[PDB]
Please model this.
Amino acid sequence: GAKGSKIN
Amino acid sequence: SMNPPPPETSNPNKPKRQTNQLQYLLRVVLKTLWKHQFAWPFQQPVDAVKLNLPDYYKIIKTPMDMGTIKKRLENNYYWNAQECIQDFNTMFTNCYIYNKPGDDIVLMAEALEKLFLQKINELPTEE
Model:
């Protein structure tokens, strides 16, 4: 979302 | 906005203490969450400039992160376990206030929070 994609 | 100053991690006027439960909070609880694969977004204050989140610090007025918590524990900043527990809860609540369900950061927070709550259920005796 606002912070974007983070999970590999 | 620019980022605010981070939360203090020491205060020469605030009484310091070590307790059984604070030692557990550092050596079991924080340790376990810190090494988790989903810890990294929570290991330092939210950098709303780098993430381009102009409204972060308009929405979140009590920022908290595990880097701050770690340093507070290492510095014997807290007087009791409840202060520390409250900071962890603030960190998670902020994430859920700012971010939307199903965002990666929220999935990450949820996983860390479940682990946190199991460790808190397991808090040792106060003395």
Summary: The helical segments of chain B are 20-34, 56-59, 66-74, 81-98, 104-121. The first helix of chain B runs from residue 20 to 34. Chain B has five helices and no strands. Chain B touches chain A at residues 38, 41, 51, 53, 98-100, 102-108 (CB under 8 Å).
